[model samples]
Target: NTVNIKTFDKVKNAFGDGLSQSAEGTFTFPADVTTVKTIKMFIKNECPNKTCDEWDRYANVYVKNKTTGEWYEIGRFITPYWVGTEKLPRGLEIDVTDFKSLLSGNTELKIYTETWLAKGREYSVDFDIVYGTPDYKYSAVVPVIQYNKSSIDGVPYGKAHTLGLKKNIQLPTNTEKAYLRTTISGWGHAKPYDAGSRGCAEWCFRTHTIAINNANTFQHQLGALGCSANPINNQSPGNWAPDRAGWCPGMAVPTRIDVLNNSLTGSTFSYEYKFQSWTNNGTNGDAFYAISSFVIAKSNTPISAPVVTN
Candidate 1:
């Protein structure tokens, strides 16, 4: 439950151009923007909310994404102060039709103006916001890879009895950071699914800058045939898997791919699924990970103890 849009002078300088029209007219909004919960407009310290902070006056909200035009500059505020019971000279509370659907572009809110003074009474502010939240929770991810061969030993992507790692493995030379998610089961599942349609999720750290020297023969380059010498022999169904064509048409689940050598330092890597080369319909396949197979060390390390001299 939040709605506050204000700007008369200038707040803490967020960005300012001022725009026009608002003696208080033009209104009509409600497409159920999940009931909004946060949106305010105003900012001006200098050069459009850059930062000149005097007494304080700031609230700059910009949100745009009709369908991915993308512009979500969301948060910043400090005003006449107080709020609630309505001390509100600057302690805002916006809701004039959600500030006219954020200044009509269908959705957009940019305002910046600032300042503050009391005894003689001098103040500045600009912001129009709305934050309701009947719904607007964003957090994304759904990656998969699981297996536990018997007990500890090894399991590059196998665990019904252990016979893993037939190819495509390399990830251990102190791996820098790599987080990938993907899965699909049963003998030769073939292009399990995922492409530009809805597959590519991302997280890359230590930057795949590529540089290795045998943590034990690293070996990476799985099916959809990119060549680790052209792999995809999960057990014969294909002969050269080429990313399985991005997962033929889609539908096996497990949508995440590629990551190696470094990813935030929380070691544990392994995979198995090979059946390179095929098309008649047997589908395509090849997934491999396992280099000497076994290294889950992660040590943020900081331990010190040894001063026993009674």
Candidate 2:
């Protein structure tokens, strides 16, 4: 079985200098259906008219956690050079199956775009969820660290303490098959040039990590990504080929999943982010990164959302 949830329908607005470009809509999802197979999110970009946002803009989609009333970044995508073209496909698609817990029941979904023009970009977002027999008897998902406030404006880099993403979490009892689902993207042209004389975030390349109990557990390498090879190759006039830190223009930021090796025996764990060695001199500019991380656990027995304290 399949259920399609439509949040935004050809939504576009640049009032207040695009300050009103964001929209929040309530999406009623299937609460009784627990057997979720997968969820696919698709975004269709079209020029509201003959004129569209000329520059590639930053955009994101978020889902609100019912319990905490906090927004979680579920999709991050960059607008292409232009839309409603023959070369470009419908738009972009990403597998958001990992966020099944947040997408269920009555939830709120929001979409945002950083466009300045009076008549800029427009988007129609939809979530097609497939239902079938689940892989396990029960599964649970909890937010480890959510840049909820930073969901629109990212956290300044150069200082890890600025984000203060450290969190204490307690997993459900008898948990098994635990994993970490996360996505990170850098923006702005910061200074303190790197070996390549490139700026910190958008231009420079670096390796960040996820820390467990103050020790780095997973390494996230940013840069050297193939951006020009994107399937949506119609963006023109605007520079759409360079790799920006961990993300690419005119595409969705990729999500990274890290496996947990330790056993969850009703124990609490600490989690944080470890940035690479780098300092902002402010000569060129400042940099920041938008990130979201979550802890997903699956078990044969019924599961519950873990307790998370930031």
Candidate 3:
């Protein structure tokens, strides 16, 4: 069985400018459905501006909490400016099924977008929920965090920023399988920098390191992977044609997933992110927007942290 939740009740403001102009829409899950097997976010670009670059924008997903009466981020995406076509066979899709438990009753889903320099673009988004037998007993947590460091404007170069979990997170009782879900986007680095100006940009290279429970677990290079094979490139021309740092011009911000080798339950856990290095004597600033969640799958048998190997 399938159920589709859309933000299409209003579409005129679906697009916005890089500055004050912004677009947002809301959706809700049916109260009748008790469980969901899969959940995905689908987005389509229908902007009319030929000069608009897809890298100039970003998107985020938030769900209102019934108990707190506040909104919390569940996901974030980088707008793929390369999909120039007026129509698409299928839009960009993101897996968010892990959040199904948080969306119910009076709770509502909201989407918002911000632009950098490009504007007059429009798009549509919806959530596709698929139902089936429950796969596992699961629990999800959303941490209400005051994550802003640098101003919303951006981050300065050569300056380092760091954050651990705002507070230690506790897993559910009898938890077995565990996963951390996060959405991140770096700003300013997408533009040119340095003497040769090769220092940092969407196409330039940088490393992001992730550590869990004080153990360094993952490392990745920004947008070093070329997406020339992506069919969407057929719609791009000029500068927008090249691959960017950690993302393609016309693609969603890549989601970073790191599986812990150690089992975690009845233990407080934390994670941290660090940039290996930064540009020297640079003028343009850089910043990153990230929201993360911890997902737990439980069983009757109590589980303990596993024996992690190097």
Candidate 4:
């Protein structure tokens, strides 16, 4: 059976000064679910009077780490256009089973959307956890890179703009299977535009790469998803049909999963979110990627989250 947990119910962005783009809350997961099979997260729209952010906006649902007190984006969604109280689907649902390790017990969560208006931008976010016999008795999620450049100090990202992790992380001795859960969202409208004067982040498309133990083992496409064919098709009268920087409007952002072909079980290895040899003209002072990576390892026996240091 699947257990449904509501984290936030119809929360309005008109909170705390009535124009805030962020909201925070927490959920206590049941202790009985020791062996999680899967977890699906939903970010539904519940705007009052059927009005809402009529334009597509960037959004993120972050879970707080109890150990480090850091916010890791566990889920992401984009608001769909709602032309004055039209009917739309329930919400965006994404499989978040990879975060099962950190989602147990009392978990803190926060939701962020870039909608600047205080009208028609409310949301109801929750999780449905499927319980079953787990393939492995133990699992862990280690946070590798967490960067959010929305602050004033937020500058150009990539190409050595931010600190790159260059260290070794030892996997749990009992680790049997391992993989990566990564999410990156681009923002800003800086110079060095792409075709049709598209700027960095919001419009520019680029390929990013990461290194595993000094070897470029993984690559990321900053743009490609077909936004026009998004499942949530009720949105209209806006830019809801064009492709975005690796994300889609009125849809759930995809979590890039890279299951290691070669297991790093019981071994220490270096990790890096490498640069792509590109530069922004610093026009917007906001062209940067909000990215995060977690190394999830599974074991036949009870295991602990890996310690990541750089």
Candidate 5:
């Protein structure tokens, strides 16, 4: 069996047709849910224009972290072209099951758009959470900052920006099975120092190597694996059609996951996120934002939510 949780309709531009590109709202889930099976978000369009172009606006969804009070994007959806004649409004659903651990208590949601919309157009979102009996017990750790250029004195601080960068972190002793969730954004590129060499620019096109405990584990471009199919393409006029180095322009920054080997459990692991190419002078240096955390399973049985601390 499953139960449903929803939020009230937050209408936009109800009083006037003024223009705004951003919208904000909130939802507070009952503290009773211990295990969540699935979560979906629905959006409705109530514009008078039967064939409005605003329906194709790209919208991003974000959730405020209860612990850090930071808005972390979870997913995105493009408004569908609406004829204003259908009995039911067009619906867009985003599967947020992966973020069940972070959805508890009070949560905030926001939608952003670079495209301007006509006045008096109304947009609202309804979040539906389908939950059932507990299956596997799971616990989540706070997404920690591993590296960032803007904050030099933050958690897990480091000054190594060039190639061959290295950092060390201790894993929880009770962690059994764990997955590292990483969020990396920003722009940077590297060029060879001399002739007969190659280089990369833009985060989406550049390649980086990730190593665990000094052993090579993953290597790939920072861009989203594949996001060209976003429905925003069908709209008549927009600049976001082109793909970015690692993320979509009007969407949430993607979170890449890399599973950790069981051998590293309870051990201090050395992580090296490196680039093969190097640069000279400060003119070509790139700025990047990165943060990661280990979502761990402590035992065979499930545990209730608690204040997760490192």
Candidate 6:
């Protein structure tokens, strides 16, 4: 297959500077597009305001083929540049198959901008020519998310509950597997009896030593402290209680508080595990107790405030 480079300029005064599509477009596959392959389009979105400090870019890009008129959301990007003064960097890139089946001769790609904004809007976009040959296998599109890990000590993402997988991870293509693994602390330094402690012990109803540990196993070694000795483990999502055992075999520590926040019972002392494993017998897998996120809500009120989804 020969590689072709195509560049398209925003139609002069057509959709304006930034061809923003608050409105999504439809796509179709051409019957003659046998064995149709790769689909790549250059898209650039700008900030609501003339100055670009923070732009509402796609956590991941979405597309809709004309055939079923179904909107197929592709994977997400590792990094999306702010529509700063500079031109939106290489819009988004997508590799698609089943090309002929999904698109028609009159097919088009609609880059989703998410939702309504308070300020700036998509100015204009240049539709680069679609390139590829029928010899290319028409692959199908699927949803995916990619997440990157950052290194820090003591603090589990200073902005823990403030984040979520839907917004943080990148999108994945078809056949792409997403195994979510995040770090959480079930213990903290505060004491179980401290007023306004906000530590894991007070909220989780548990006490223990060490806030965070790299070991896969933990022990209920905190005497009179319950699980509160461990800052990270002290506060857990779901209906977790210090008096109750079985968090895990080794006093199991919790990781990925942000990840659990959504899946678990947002109520105090209760937590949920989304990535549960099962055998042929349909038995719940041990991975359920695995680490994800940790939290300590007082009574029914969560310690951390709700995150801004918008």
Best by lDDT: 2
How would you encode candidate 2's per-residue C-alpha lDDT over 8-84 as one tens digit per residue? 78877454652477778887888854688888998887864457777677778888888778787788777777654
Question: In order, what lDDT does every prediction score?
Answer: 0.28, 0.76, 0.54, 0.73, 0.50, 0.28
Q: Is 3 or 5 the stronger prediction by TM-score? A: 3
The digit string of per-residue lDDT tens for model 3 on 252-307 reads 66666655443656566665555566644445545443434444343335343222
**Local accuracy of candidate 5 as per-residue lDDT tens digits, 179-265:** 656655443343322232322233335566778777788774665444456543342344445455565532445556777787876
Alpha-carbon RMSD, candidate 6 = 19.3
List pairs with backbone clashes in candidate 2: none
Model 3: colliding residue pairs? 54-81, 80-250, 80-251, 190-202, 202-244, 202-245, 222-246, 223-246, 263-306
**lDDT over C-alpha atoms for residue 100 of model 6:** 26
Cand. 5 Cα-lDDT: 0.50
Query: Would you list the rank order by lDDT, best first?
Result: 2, 4, 3, 5, 6, 1
Candidate 4, residue 184: how far the Cα is off, in Å: 0.7
The residue-by-residue lDDT of candidate 1 on 125-144, one tens digit each, is 34444545423222111112
TM-score on alpha carbons, each prediction? 0.16, 0.90, 0.76, 0.87, 0.60, 0.33
Q: Write the per-residue lDDT of candidate 4 for residues 36-125, one digit (tens) a residue.
A: 888888777775444676766667778887887878778776677764222445467778777776788888888877766667377787
Error of 2 at 1 (Å): 3.1
Q: Which ten-residue region of model 1 has the weakest summed lDDT?
A: 200-209
Candidate 6: worst-modelled 10 consecutive residues by lDDT: 281-290
User: Candidate 4 clashing pairs?
Assistant: 50-85, 52-120
Worst 10-residue lDDT window, candidate 4: 149-158
The 10 consecutive residues of candidate 2 with the worst lDDT sum are 82-91
- Give the total clashing residue pairs for model 5: 5
- Candidates 3 and 6: which is better by TM-score? 3
Model 1, which residues run further than 4 Å from truth? 1-52, 56-91, 98-106, 115-310
